[PDB]
Every structure is written in C-alpha cells, then in structure tokens.
Amino acid sequence: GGWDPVLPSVTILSLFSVFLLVILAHVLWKK
Amino acid sequence: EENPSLFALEAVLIPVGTVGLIITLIFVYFWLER
C-alpha cells in the first residue's frame, strides 16, 4: 500500500520485439 | 495533412519487420522440408 508503479506499454512492446528477434536469429542460425 | 510521426511508429520499426521476416523464414523452412 503506497501507490505501486506500473510498467509502461513501451516496455511490453520492447519485450515482444526482442522475442520475435530471437525467432529470426534462431531460424537463420539453424539454417 | 497527415503526420509522419505515426508512419515511423514503433510497430513498423521492429514488430512488423520481425513478424514479416519470421513468417517468411518459417515458410522457407517448411518448403525446404529437410
């Protein structure tokens, strides 16, 4: 109790970007 | 009349680019088979 900070939308979008990036690097690495 | 700020938005900067390349790559893998 005392106003807890909440993560922003930019951070979530950033996370999704990194994850998708890992998919691209994984497919090219395994190719 | 429109603004270029929204055209260079975040979705075009990384998610659209990665999603497109990822979909194309997985399709390429399926085509190759082995």
Inter-residue contact B16 to A18 (CB < 8 Å): no
Contact A27 B18 (CB under 8 A): no
Rounded-to-integer distance, Cα B8 and Cα B2, Å: 12
Contact B15 A21 (CB under 8 A): no
**Which experimental method was this entry solved with?**
NMR
CA distances from A11 to A16, B9, B17, B19, B30 (A): 9, 15, 18, 18, 33
Contact A27 B10 (CB under 8 A): no
Residue of B nearest to A30 (CA): B29
Rounded-to-integer distance, Cα B13 and Cα A17, Å: 9
Q: What single-letter amino acid sits at B33?
A: E
Which are the contacts of B12, defined by CB distance < 8 A and separation ≥ 6?
A: none
